[PDB]
Amino acid sequence: PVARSWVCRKTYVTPRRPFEKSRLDQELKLIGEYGLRNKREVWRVKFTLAKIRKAARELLTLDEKDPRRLFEGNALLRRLVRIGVLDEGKMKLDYILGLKIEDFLERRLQTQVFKLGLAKSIHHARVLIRQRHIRVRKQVVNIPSFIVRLDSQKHIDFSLRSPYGGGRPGRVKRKNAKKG
Amino acid sequence: DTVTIRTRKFMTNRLLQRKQMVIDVLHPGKATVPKTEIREKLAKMYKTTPDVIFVFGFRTHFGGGKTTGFGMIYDSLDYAKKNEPKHRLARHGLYEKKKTSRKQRKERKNRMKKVRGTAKANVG
Amino acid sequence: ARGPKKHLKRVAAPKHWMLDKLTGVFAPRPSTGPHKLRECLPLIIFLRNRLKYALTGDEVKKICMQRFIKIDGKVRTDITYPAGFMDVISIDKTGENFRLIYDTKGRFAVHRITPEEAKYKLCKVRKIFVGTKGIPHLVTHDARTIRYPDPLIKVNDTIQIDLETGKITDFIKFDTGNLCMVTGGANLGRIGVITNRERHPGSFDVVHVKDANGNSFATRLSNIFVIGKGNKPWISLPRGKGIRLTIAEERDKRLAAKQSSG
RNA sequence: CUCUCGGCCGAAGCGUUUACUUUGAAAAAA
RNA sequence: UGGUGACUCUAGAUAACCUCGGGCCGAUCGCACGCCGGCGGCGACGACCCAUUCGAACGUCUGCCCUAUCAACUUUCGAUGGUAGUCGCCGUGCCUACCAUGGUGACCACGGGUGACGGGGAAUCAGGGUUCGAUUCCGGAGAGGGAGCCUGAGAAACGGCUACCACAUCCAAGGAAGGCAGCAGGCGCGCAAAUUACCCACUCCCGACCCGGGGAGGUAGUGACGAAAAAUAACAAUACAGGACUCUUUCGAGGCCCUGUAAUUGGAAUGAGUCCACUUUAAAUCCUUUAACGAGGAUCCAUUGGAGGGCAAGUCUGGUGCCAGCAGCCGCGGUAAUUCCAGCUCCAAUAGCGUAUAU
RNA sequence: UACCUGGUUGAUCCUGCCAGUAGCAUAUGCUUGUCUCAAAGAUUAAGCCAUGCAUGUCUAAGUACGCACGGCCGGUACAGUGAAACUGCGAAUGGCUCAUUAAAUCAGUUAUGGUUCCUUUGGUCGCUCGUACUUGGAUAACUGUGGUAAUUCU
């Protein structure tokens, strides 16, 4: 017996057909457009959307006045709205089935850092986040896959300690200024 | 002073003759604040000496803004010696533990098990 | 196994203790006592997990061995002493009295009572029997034996015990129309008026209960604890008055409370 | 009807039975 | 007297018994102190008995894998039931003595096998299913194999005892002492699995106990079982390329866009790492947090498989010549081999990828 | 994601299997920078084990004439701390493993009106019509004498 927990879970699913030209092209387009490291990030977002769709489908088989359908559909729609993937106007479970993987990919911290003008490109955005230059509200966030909530979107700033956002020039600039 | 001390949670534990609280330490450009100066800041904050203050469990949040720990302020140093864990008293210099190891004590005990009477004290 | 067990695994502990899973391998095995293992709250869980007066089991022991904790008017130094339903916990040093009373979720609430209320407790009589040359005896859910009870007191009634002297001062019969709490099952912690008792000879009687908001449920007779005559309780009730809101109403109440701040 | 009927309340009946279906209890935690 | 659906219940009364291996009815310990020889407060400990708690034990109903190359099985070596008893904590063929001749079975008894502990559960899965579950929770069983006990409330206990069987330790040869399927560790076995580490600080347990003890447990070490997050560059200029209703062709309306061999040019930005002080923690480590140094082949260098099809990706170059080899399958190799051995290039996943096997 | 593809023929449509495909679990190979969780001698051998440790325990409150420390030199028995030992309690829990085991174990469901129950908690405990201002003998520890090669022997 140990005081440890072994609840662990795989966050993606490998495609059934390994070498399929259309799927390879779609995934590479997503990777390049959103500056992703590998195919596993695409597969992870795909798995997230797949689980959400499965839950929405299972709710859509219940009676429209089912207490569980009402409660859990309201919760799921609230969660999707909270991260900006769903619009507040479309608060029906049928609109969940109309969601795309790109809808979730827009809400990554990397995409928002690029799209708010803090970075010149999506790859610059990723290296900025990985180098502790970005904060959401007052928390220095370091994870590119950080899914920005709707009310956290206006609090993505440039970190009070980063050379770009409050001073203390970096290693290179300080060394060069010391040199001459 | 650029280092700030705040106490979110707080209760007067009259059962253990102390006050117990959660301590936030704001230290934007400094290392995690040493326990001693947190103790003197708490002493000023609560109008008491820093010898009846025992702080522990300070974790600095990712990014470096602040550190959260726990703190006790005892009514007297005698209550502090009575109720505090021995290691937290040793951190203040008010306690010294046994210098033997578990191995030495266990083997000495099993050796004493082999002798009967006053000869047990004449072992090791 | 040979002989009795002395340990309780943390995950086999009663879920209403609200113990987490990463603190340790073991849960505090309640000592034998007035209440059953699964229907009790040990003193350590109350003084450490609920009241936060202690951080560890060592501090719970330090509090208990100063004789600051009274359970039902008597000082208890056993930190795993099983405190159960209706039991009164008095801490005179901090001047606070609690009565162990179930929540609508089936958990023992931290329910503070006045020092005047802390003088008595309700007890459901478990059995009535004649012994010792015609002396009537009464046994409660608290497991206290009372000699010479009122001749009208029967099984499943509720008596009021003055903790200082431990003798019956009043009693409610088990009648339709009396307020009652549920002390076990799916409806544990719910308070309502007894509507009807369907009797099943040789099996378990079912008691139907109606909430103060009009919700009707049913339990086994062994899970019914008469609280007050009519619809007026003889004890203080927690903030939730035994009315179990559905999850939708809980969500709505939480959202309304959150939106009222800021 | 209810072999207790009393000037709105209860001794008012698995009323051959079962399967089925819909309930309600009770049913460890993880 | 009360109670149950239901007593041969509870309570009462009578006549007696009342176990030498004889049962309860206190020859006990502390603290505080008292009160016109007496009366006492607060406890600790102990003893019946009755409840209660924690259980244990024994029954009820339903549910278990494969096998008929297992069709009949059991029958006083108690088999099924009855009566009386014995024993047992108690119900009972539990055992005994008489009596009856029963009881189970194709609705699969009985026998056999199981690389069979059962369950909660796990993998996979459109719906249905299939396989797995030694493994941290619950229940059972065992402590080398059997058997038998002592003590005790509780054990047929094995970090208790007694004996035999197997193995085995010391011996002065007379004797004596054994039980890691506890924690480490060793040998052996194998395709196959970690430290003879630190601590009772946490969770709890035990004790006469606030204080002692705990290889339970926690903490570190080994760890690519597996799961999560996530670096190996980003940007700008320069030369070049591409589009942008560019005029129905040639840098006179081609830089408010975009790409790359660029060993081109620049500054910025970083953590991998090293190191300091905190923090962490029994004490440490780790993470977090400061600070110092730390990137231009940023040589601080990403690999594992493949490139005929299935199936993403070269009938490019050299070698070999039905050889060596490749190839899960079809096939390739006999002098232009898109398939072997290599170089270059490419592409699949990526701190991971290939292979075998089970599913 | 309720999915298929190659292979029998000169060619075709089938049956049909082989091979491919994805997960999962053990092993292994090559490779491996950061960080958080985290399995880990089950499978074969419930095979064998060197060594060490894993179960002990004292309160004001059972027994202290161990000077082992320690005082207030006394109708002052016992100041106090306290090894040892006697007494009490625990050692039947925990941990390990899966050999046995096929209505057996186990699961849900009931029953004990057919039983036992240390401890905890509450009750009962002048309810008995018949040296007490405290009874008896031992034995440990301790002192002293020993035996055996050898033991937690005595």
PDB file of N, CA and C (backbone and C1' of nucleotides) in Angstrom, chain C residues 2-3 6 9-10 26 28-29 32-33 36-37 48 56-57 65 127 130 133 139 143 154 201-202, chain E residues 1-3 5 10-12 51-54 137 154-155 157-158 202-206 210-211 216-217:
ATOM      1  N   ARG C   2      -7.548 -13.672  11.967  1.00  0.00           N
ATOM      2  CA  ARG C   2      -7.657 -14.044  13.368  1.00  0.00           C
ATOM      3  C   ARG C   2      -7.948 -12.785  14.172  1.00  0.00           C
ATOM      4  N   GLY C   3      -8.876 -12.877  15.114  1.00  0.00           N
ATOM      5  CA  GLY C   3      -9.205 -11.758  15.966  1.00  0.00           C
ATOM      6  C   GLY C   3      -9.620 -10.497  15.229  1.00  0.00           C
ATOM      7  N   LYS C   6      -7.587  -3.743  13.477  1.00  0.00           N
ATOM      8  CA  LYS C   6      -7.215  -2.553  14.218  1.00  0.00           C
ATOM      9  C   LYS C   6      -6.916  -1.359  13.329  1.00  0.00           C
ATOM     10  N   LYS C   9      -8.038   1.443   6.224  1.00  0.00           N
ATOM     11  CA  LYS C   9      -7.436   2.054   5.052  1.00  0.00           C
ATOM     12  C   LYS C   9      -8.170   3.340   4.702  1.00  0.00           C
ATOM     13  N   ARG C  10      -7.414   4.335   4.238  1.00  0.00           N
ATOM     14  CA  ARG C  10      -7.993   5.648   3.978  1.00  0.00           C
ATOM     15  C   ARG C  10      -9.093   5.583   2.936  1.00  0.00           C
ATOM     16  N   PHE C  26      -3.590   5.258   5.693  1.00  0.00           N
ATOM     17  CA  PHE C  26      -4.545   4.889   6.722  1.00  0.00           C
ATOM     18  C   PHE C  26      -5.452   6.058   7.069  1.00  0.00           C
ATOM     19  N   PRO C  28      -8.060   7.204  10.404  1.00  0.00           N
ATOM     20  CA  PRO C  28      -8.136   6.882  11.830  1.00  0.00           C
ATOM     21  C   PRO C  28      -9.269   5.918  12.104  1.00  0.00           C
ATOM     22  N   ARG C  29      -8.920   4.692  12.456  1.00  0.00           N
ATOM     23  CA  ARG C  29      -9.911   3.679  12.768  1.00  0.00           C
ATOM     24  C   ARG C  29     -10.651   4.101  14.027  1.00  0.00           C
ATOM     25  N   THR C  32     -14.043   1.536  19.387  1.00  0.00           N
ATOM     26  CA  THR C  32     -15.360   1.040  19.739  1.00  0.00           C
ATOM     27  C   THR C  32     -16.034   2.033  20.674  1.00  0.00           C
ATOM     28  N   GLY C  33     -17.349   2.134  20.569  1.00  0.00           N
ATOM     29  CA  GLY C  33     -18.055   3.112  21.351  1.00  0.00           C
ATOM     30  C   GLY C  33     -19.532   3.183  21.062  1.00  0.00           C
ATOM     31  N   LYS C  36     -21.709   3.345  15.594  1.00  0.00           N
ATOM     32  CA  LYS C  36     -21.085   2.388  14.702  1.00  0.00           C
ATOM     33  C   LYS C  36     -19.934   3.040  13.945  1.00  0.00           C
ATOM     34  N   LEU C  37     -19.067   2.194  13.389  1.00  0.00           N
ATOM     35  CA  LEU C  37     -17.858   2.685  12.736  1.00  0.00           C
ATOM     36  C   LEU C  37     -18.187   3.566  11.540  1.00  0.00           C
ATOM     37  N   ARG C  48      -9.457  18.259  13.517  1.00  0.00           N
ATOM     38  CA  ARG C  48      -8.403  18.545  12.556  1.00  0.00           C
ATOM     39  C   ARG C  48      -8.940  18.863  11.172  1.00  0.00           C
ATOM     40  N   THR C  56      -2.143  18.273  12.544  1.00  0.00           N
ATOM     41  CA  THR C  56      -1.712  16.889  12.485  1.00  0.00           C
ATOM     42  C   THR C  56      -2.447  16.102  13.558  1.00  0.00           C
ATOM     43  N   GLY C  57      -2.238  14.785  13.560  1.00  0.00           N
ATOM     44  CA  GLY C  57      -2.793  13.964  14.620  1.00  0.00           C
ATOM     45  C   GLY C  57      -2.105  14.184  15.950  1.00  0.00           C
ATOM     46  N   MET C  65      -5.516  15.669  25.205  1.00  0.00           N
ATOM     47  CA  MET C  65      -4.901  15.319  26.478  1.00  0.00           C
ATOM     48  C   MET C  65      -4.816  16.487  27.447  1.00  0.00           C
ATOM     49  N   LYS C 127     -34.439  -0.159  21.985  1.00  0.00           N
ATOM     50  CA  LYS C 127     -35.243  -1.261  22.497  1.00  0.00           C
ATOM     51  C   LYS C 127     -35.729  -0.960  23.906  1.00  0.00           C
ATOM     52  N   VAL C 130     -37.886  -5.593  29.904  1.00  0.00           N
ATOM     53  CA  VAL C 130     -38.023  -5.717  31.349  1.00  0.00           C
ATOM     54  C   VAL C 130     -36.935  -6.649  31.858  1.00  0.00           C
ATOM     55  N   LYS C 133     -35.986  -7.983  38.164  1.00  0.00           N
ATOM     56  CA  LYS C 133     -37.234  -8.036  38.934  1.00  0.00           C
ATOM     57  C   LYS C 133     -38.191  -6.903  38.554  1.00  0.00           C
ATOM     58  N   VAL C 139     -32.978   1.272  25.838  1.00  0.00           N
ATOM     59  CA  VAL C 139     -31.690   1.389  25.164  1.00  0.00           C
ATOM     60  C   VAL C 139     -31.880   2.277  23.946  1.00  0.00           C
ATOM     61  N   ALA C 143     -26.575   4.176  22.699  1.00  0.00           N
ATOM     62  CA  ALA C 143     -26.188   2.984  23.450  1.00  0.00           C
ATOM     63  C   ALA C 143     -26.200   3.196  24.954  1.00  0.00           C
ATOM     64  N   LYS C 154     -41.957   3.816  23.712  1.00  0.00           N
ATOM     65  CA  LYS C 154     -41.820   2.573  22.973  1.00  0.00           C
ATOM     66  C   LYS C 154     -40.624   2.663  22.036  1.00  0.00           C
ATOM     67  N   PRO C 201     -44.426  -7.258   7.794  1.00  0.00           N
ATOM     68  CA  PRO C 201     -44.051  -8.200   8.854  1.00  0.00           C
ATOM     69  C   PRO C 201     -42.942  -9.137   8.402  1.00  0.00           C
ATOM     70  N   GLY C 202     -41.972  -9.344   9.286  1.00  0.00           N
ATOM     71  CA  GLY C 202     -40.837 -10.174   8.949  1.00  0.00           C
ATOM     72  C   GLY C 202     -39.836  -9.525   8.029  1.00  0.00           C
TER      73      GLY C 202
ATOM     74  O5'   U E   1     -48.168  -7.695  35.872  1.00  0.00           O
ATOM     75  C5'   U E   1     -48.230  -7.099  34.585  1.00  0.00           C
ATOM     76  C4'   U E   1     -46.942  -6.398  34.234  1.00  0.00           C
ATOM     77  C3'   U E   1     -46.797  -5.987  32.779  1.00  0.00           C
ATOM     78  O3'   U E   1     -47.450  -4.765  32.492  1.00  0.00           O
ATOM     79  C1'   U E   1     -44.826  -7.078  33.486  1.00  0.00           C
ATOM     80  P     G E   2     -47.710  -4.335  30.972  1.00  0.00           P
ATOM     81  O5'   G E   2     -46.300  -3.775  30.497  1.00  0.00           O
ATOM     82  C5'   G E   2     -46.094  -3.394  29.150  1.00  0.00           C
ATOM     83  C4'   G E   2     -44.696  -3.710  28.693  1.00  0.00           C
ATOM     84  C3'   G E   2     -44.581  -4.239  27.278  1.00  0.00           C
ATOM     85  O3'   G E   2     -44.656  -3.227  26.296  1.00  0.00           O
ATOM     86  C1'   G E   2     -43.319  -5.602  28.705  1.00  0.00           C
ATOM     87  P     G E   3     -45.605  -3.435  25.022  1.00  0.00           P
ATOM     88  O5'   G E   3     -44.678  -4.226  24.002  1.00  0.00           O
ATOM     89  C5'   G E   3     -43.338  -3.818  23.797  1.00  0.00           C
ATOM     90  C4'   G E   3     -42.491  -4.938  23.256  1.00  0.00           C
ATOM     91  C3'   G E   3     -43.002  -5.614  22.000  1.00  0.00           C
ATOM     92  O3'   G E   3     -42.741  -4.865  20.832  1.00  0.00           O
ATOM     93  C1'   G E   3     -42.287  -7.248  23.539  1.00  0.00           C
ATOM     94  P     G E   5     -43.820  -7.012  14.787  1.00  0.00           P
ATOM     95  O5'   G E   5     -44.475  -8.262  14.061  1.00  0.00           O
ATOM     96  C5'   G E   5     -45.871  -8.337  13.832  1.00  0.00           C
ATOM     97  C4'   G E   5     -46.238  -9.696  13.309  1.00  0.00           C
ATOM     98  C3'   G E   5     -45.986 -10.852  14.262  1.00  0.00           C
ATOM     99  O3'   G E   5     -47.062 -11.047  15.160  1.00  0.00           O
ATOM    100  C1'   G E   5     -45.093 -11.364  12.135  1.00  0.00           C
ATOM    101  P     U E  10     -35.996 -15.628  28.220  1.00  0.00           P
ATOM    102  O5'   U E  10     -36.450 -14.159  28.620  1.00  0.00           O
ATOM    103  C5'   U E  10     -35.738 -13.023  28.158  1.00  0.00           C
ATOM    104  C4'   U E  10     -36.430 -11.751  28.571  1.00  0.00           C
ATOM    105  C3'   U E  10     -36.766 -11.637  30.045  1.00  0.00           C
ATOM    106  O3'   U E  10     -35.661 -11.269  30.845  1.00  0.00           O
ATOM    107  C1'   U E  10     -38.650 -11.032  28.778  1.00  0.00           C
ATOM    108  P     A E  11     -35.429 -11.999  32.251  1.00  0.00           P
ATOM    109  O5'   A E  11     -36.681 -11.536  33.116  1.00  0.00           O
ATOM    110  C5'   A E  11     -36.792 -10.189  33.534  1.00  0.00           C
ATOM    111  C4'   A E  11     -38.154  -9.872  34.094  1.00  0.00           C
ATOM    112  C3'   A E  11     -38.632 -10.736  35.242  1.00  0.00           C
ATOM    113  O3'   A E  11     -38.030 -10.435  36.487  1.00  0.00           O
ATOM    114  C1'   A E  11     -40.371 -10.511  33.695  1.00  0.00           C
ATOM    115  P     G E  12     -37.665 -11.635  37.487  1.00  0.00           P
ATOM    116  O5'   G E  12     -39.079 -12.089  38.060  1.00  0.00           O
ATOM    117  C5'   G E  12     -39.965 -11.139  38.633  1.00  0.00           C
ATOM    118  C4'   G E  12     -41.346 -11.708  38.849  1.00  0.00           C
ATOM    119  C3'   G E  12     -41.440 -12.929  39.741  1.00  0.00           C
ATOM    120  O3'   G E  12     -41.329 -12.627  41.118  1.00  0.00           O
ATOM    121  C1'   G E  12     -42.779 -13.258  37.837  1.00  0.00           C
ATOM    122  P     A E  51     -28.051  -8.979  26.703  1.00  0.00           P
ATOM    123  O5'   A E  51     -28.686  -7.626  26.176  1.00  0.00           O
ATOM    124  C5'   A E  51     -28.058  -6.880  25.153  1.00  0.00           C
ATOM    125  C4'   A E  51     -28.167  -5.406  25.424  1.00  0.00           C
ATOM    126  C3'   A E  51     -27.370  -4.515  24.492  1.00  0.00           C
ATOM    127  O3'   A E  51     -28.043  -4.265  23.276  1.00  0.00           O
ATOM    128  C1'   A E  51     -26.938  -3.887  26.712  1.00  0.00           C
ATOM    129  P     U E  52     -27.391  -4.744  21.897  1.00  0.00           P
ATOM    130  O5'   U E  52     -26.499  -3.506  21.456  1.00  0.00           O
ATOM    131  C5'   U E  52     -26.844  -2.185  21.834  1.00  0.00           C
ATOM    132  C4'   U E  52     -25.631  -1.296  21.849  1.00  0.00           C
ATOM    133  C3'   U E  52     -24.568  -1.627  20.818  1.00  0.00           C
ATOM    134  O3'   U E  52     -24.866  -1.109  19.536  1.00  0.00           O
ATOM    135  C1'   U E  52     -23.549  -1.296  22.919  1.00  0.00           C
ATOM    136  P     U E  53     -24.451  -1.929  18.224  1.00  0.00           P
ATOM    137  O5'   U E  53     -22.916  -1.570  18.016  1.00  0.00           O
ATOM    138  C5'   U E  53     -22.472  -0.224  17.978  1.00  0.00           C
ATOM    139  C4'   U E  53     -20.990  -0.134  18.220  1.00  0.00           C
ATOM    140  C3'   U E  53     -20.127  -1.056  17.378  1.00  0.00           C
ATOM    141  O3'   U E  53     -19.877  -0.531  16.090  1.00  0.00           O
ATOM    142  C1'   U E  53     -19.451  -1.188  19.636  1.00  0.00           C
ATOM    143  P     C E  54     -19.937  -1.484  14.808  1.00  0.00           P
ATOM    144  O5'   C E  54     -18.525  -2.202  14.811  1.00  0.00           O
ATOM    145  C5'   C E  54     -17.328  -1.446  14.836  1.00  0.00           C
ATOM    146  C4'   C E  54     -16.163  -2.300  15.253  1.00  0.00           C
ATOM    147  C3'   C E  54     -16.044  -3.638  14.549  1.00  0.00           C
ATOM    148  O3'   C E  54     -15.471  -3.541  13.259  1.00  0.00           O
ATOM    149  C1'   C E  54     -15.786  -3.955  16.867  1.00  0.00           C
ATOM    150  P     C E 137      -4.423  -1.773   0.215  1.00  0.00           P
ATOM    151  O5'   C E 137      -5.915  -1.610  -0.292  1.00  0.00           O
ATOM    152  C5'   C E 137      -6.655  -0.441  -0.006  1.00  0.00           C
ATOM    153  C4'   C E 137      -8.121  -0.663  -0.251  1.00  0.00           C
ATOM    154  C3'   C E 137      -8.701  -1.936   0.331  1.00  0.00           C
ATOM    155  O3'   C E 137      -9.015  -1.807   1.703  1.00  0.00           O
ATOM    156  C1'   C E 137      -9.392  -1.716  -1.913  1.00  0.00           C
ATOM    157  P     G E 154     -10.809 -17.404  23.367  1.00  0.00           P
ATOM    158  O5'   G E 154     -10.576 -16.877  21.888  1.00  0.00           O
ATOM    159  C5'   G E 154     -11.657 -16.569  21.021  1.00  0.00           C
ATOM    160  C4'   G E 154     -11.180 -15.718  19.875  1.00  0.00           C
ATOM    161  C3'   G E 154      -9.934 -16.235  19.180  1.00  0.00           C
ATOM    162  O3'   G E 154     -10.244 -17.173  18.167  1.00  0.00           O
ATOM    163  C1'   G E 154      -9.648 -13.950  19.726  1.00  0.00           C
ATOM    164  P     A E 155      -9.590 -18.633  18.179  1.00  0.00           P
ATOM    165  O5'   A E 155      -8.165 -18.403  17.524  1.00  0.00           O
ATOM    166  C5'   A E 155      -8.034 -17.649  16.328  1.00  0.00           C
ATOM    167  C4'   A E 155      -6.776 -18.006  15.585  1.00  0.00           C
ATOM    168  C3'   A E 155      -6.499 -19.501  15.454  1.00  0.00           C
ATOM    169  O3'   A E 155      -5.896 -19.760  14.190  1.00  0.00           O
ATOM    170  C1'   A E 155      -4.690 -18.451  16.541  1.00  0.00           C
ATOM    171  P     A E 157      -2.068 -22.704  12.400  1.00  0.00           P
ATOM    172  O5'   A E 157      -1.887 -21.404  13.294  1.00  0.00           O
ATOM    173  C5'   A E 157      -2.667 -20.241  13.062  1.00  0.00           C
ATOM    174  C4'   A E 157      -1.848 -18.989  13.232  1.00  0.00           C
ATOM    175  C3'   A E 157      -0.376 -19.121  12.844  1.00  0.00           C
ATOM    176  O3'   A E 157       0.085 -17.896  12.282  1.00  0.00           O
ATOM    177  C1'   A E 157      -0.543 -18.467  15.101  1.00  0.00           C
ATOM    178  P     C E 158      -0.028 -17.628  10.707  1.00  0.00           P
ATOM    179  O5'   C E 158       1.478 -17.409  10.235  1.00  0.00           O
ATOM    180  C5'   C E 158       2.393 -18.489  10.146  1.00  0.00           C
ATOM    181  C4'   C E 158       3.097 -18.713  11.457  1.00  0.00           C
ATOM    182  C3'   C E 158       4.456 -18.064  11.636  1.00  0.00           C
ATOM    183  O3'   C E 158       4.338 -16.705  12.020  1.00  0.00           O
ATOM    184  C1'   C E 158       4.434 -20.285  12.521  1.00  0.00           C
ATOM    185  P     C E 202       4.294  14.118  12.973  1.00  0.00           P
ATOM    186  O5'   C E 202       3.679  13.900  11.527  1.00  0.00           O
ATOM    187  C5'   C E 202       3.353  15.003  10.700  1.00  0.00           C
ATOM    188  C4'   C E 202       2.880  14.546   9.348  1.00  0.00           C
ATOM    189  C3'   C E 202       1.741  13.544   9.356  1.00  0.00           C
ATOM    190  O3'   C E 202       0.481  14.172   9.494  1.00  0.00           O
ATOM    191  C1'   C E 202       3.427  12.823   7.863  1.00  0.00           C
ATOM    192  P     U E 203      -0.676  13.484  10.359  1.00  0.00           P
ATOM    193  O5'   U E 203      -1.037  12.180   9.537  1.00  0.00           O
ATOM    194  C5'   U E 203      -1.626  12.253   8.250  1.00  0.00           C
ATOM    195  C4'   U E 203      -1.963  10.873   7.765  1.00  0.00           C
ATOM    196  C3'   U E 203      -2.695  10.022   8.782  1.00  0.00           C
ATOM    197  O3'   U E 203      -4.087  10.225   8.701  1.00  0.00           O
ATOM    198  C1'   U E 203      -0.868   8.811   7.897  1.00  0.00           C
ATOM    199  P     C E 204      -4.981  10.163  10.017  1.00  0.00           P
ATOM    200  O5'   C E 204      -5.148   8.605  10.271  1.00  0.00           O
ATOM    201  C5'   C E 204      -4.802   8.029  11.516  1.00  0.00           C
ATOM    202  C4'   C E 204      -4.265   6.635  11.341  1.00  0.00           C
ATOM    203  C3'   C E 204      -4.117   5.821  12.613  1.00  0.00           C
ATOM    204  O3'   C E 204      -5.328   5.214  13.021  1.00  0.00           O
ATOM    205  C1'   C E 204      -2.123   5.690  11.375  1.00  0.00           C
ATOM    206  P     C E 205      -5.554   4.812  14.554  1.00  0.00           P
ATOM    207  O5'   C E 205      -4.581   3.575  14.774  1.00  0.00           O
ATOM    208  C5'   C E 205      -4.789   2.353  14.086  1.00  0.00           C
ATOM    209  C4'   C E 205      -3.722   1.349  14.426  1.00  0.00           C
ATOM    210  C3'   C E 205      -3.476   1.130  15.904  1.00  0.00           C
ATOM    211  O3'   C E 205      -4.424   0.267  16.493  1.00  0.00           O
ATOM    212  C1'   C E 205      -1.412   1.403  14.808  1.00  0.00           C
ATOM    213  P     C E 206      -4.871   0.490  18.014  1.00  0.00           P
ATOM    214  O5'   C E 206      -3.679  -0.145  18.846  1.00  0.00           O
ATOM    215  C5'   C E 206      -3.235  -1.462  18.577  1.00  0.00           C
ATOM    216  C4'   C E 206      -1.912  -1.742  19.234  1.00  0.00           C
ATOM    217  C3'   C E 206      -1.787  -1.327  20.684  1.00  0.00           C
ATOM    218  O3'   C E 206      -2.430  -2.217  21.575  1.00  0.00           O
ATOM    219  C1'   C E 206       0.147  -0.665  19.516  1.00  0.00           C
ATOM    220  P     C E 210      -0.233   9.941  29.072  1.00  0.00           P
ATOM    221  O5'   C E 210       0.021  10.873  27.809  1.00  0.00           O
ATOM    222  C5'   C E 210      -0.333  10.449  26.498  1.00  0.00           C
ATOM    223  C4'   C E 210       0.167  11.404  25.441  1.00  0.00           C
ATOM    224  C3'   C E 210       1.676  11.624  25.406  1.00  0.00           C
ATOM    225  O3'   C E 210       2.092  11.801  24.055  1.00  0.00           O
ATOM    226  C1'   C E 210       0.590  13.688  25.724  1.00  0.00           C
ATOM    227  P     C E 211       2.829  10.612  23.270  1.00  0.00           P
ATOM    228  O5'   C E 211       4.317  10.660  23.819  1.00  0.00           O
ATOM    229  C5'   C E 211       5.267  11.570  23.283  1.00  0.00           C
ATOM    230  C4'   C E 211       6.535  11.592  24.101  1.00  0.00           C
ATOM    231  C3'   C E 211       7.175  10.232  24.354  1.00  0.00           C
ATOM    232  O3'   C E 211       8.591  10.385  24.405  1.00  0.00           O
ATOM    233  C1'   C E 211       6.604  11.233  26.419  1.00  0.00           C
ATOM    234  P     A E 216       7.653  -3.528   5.848  1.00  0.00           P
ATOM    235  O5'   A E 216       6.416  -3.098   6.736  1.00  0.00           O
ATOM    236  C5'   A E 216       5.801  -1.855   6.495  1.00  0.00           C
ATOM    237  C4'   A E 216       4.381  -1.811   6.972  1.00  0.00           C
ATOM    238  C3'   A E 216       3.566  -0.705   6.335  1.00  0.00           C
ATOM    239  O3'   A E 216       2.993  -1.098   5.102  1.00  0.00           O
ATOM    240  C1'   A E 216       3.353  -0.577   8.676  1.00  0.00           C
ATOM    241  P     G E 217       3.534  -0.487   3.726  1.00  0.00           P
ATOM    242  O5'   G E 217       3.541   1.083   3.979  1.00  0.00           O
ATOM    243  C5'   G E 217       2.334   1.800   4.191  1.00  0.00           C
ATOM    244  C4'   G E 217       2.574   3.075   4.955  1.00  0.00           C
ATOM    245  C3'   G E 217       3.498   4.082   4.297  1.00  0.00           C
ATOM    246  O3'   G E 217       2.864   4.845   3.291  1.00  0.00           O
ATOM    247  C1'   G E 217       4.140   3.808   6.535  1.00  0.00           C
TER     248        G E 217
END
